[PDB]
């Protein structure tokens, strides 16, 4: 009631680094509990609150950070 998670997949995550470039930056957002930007899976899971901050902010931040946040479930 509040709280939640989403998985998205992010092309462009070159060579470790990009991982924390996402993760550390996303952890600023005042509605995220926990990130996990795994490179091998090419996946960012985000445990953020979907009621407040919402998916869109994240997806466009991720986009703007210079990656391709494709959705996992569908596109």
Residue 35 annotated as part of some ligand binding site = no
Element (H, E) at 24: helix 18-26
Distance between alpha carbon 48 and the CA centroid of its chain, in Å?
9
Record the tokens describing residue 68, joined without a space: 């391709």
Report the 10 Å Cβ neighbour count for 72.
Answer: 13
Residue 15 annotated as part of some ligand binding site = yes
Residues flagged as binding site for Cu(+): 15, 18
Residues flagged as binding site: 15, 18
């Amino acid at each position: 009631m509040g709280d939640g998670v989403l998985e998205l997949v992010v092309r462009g995550m070159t060579c470790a680094s990009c991982v924390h470039k996402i993760e550390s930056s996303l952890t600023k957002h005042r509605g995220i509990l926990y990130c996990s930007v795994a490179l091998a899976t090419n996946k960012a899971h985000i445990k953020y609150d979907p009621e407040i901050i919402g998916p869109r902010d994240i997806i466009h931040t991720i986009e703007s950070l210079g990656f391709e946040p494709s959705l996992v479930k569908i596109e």
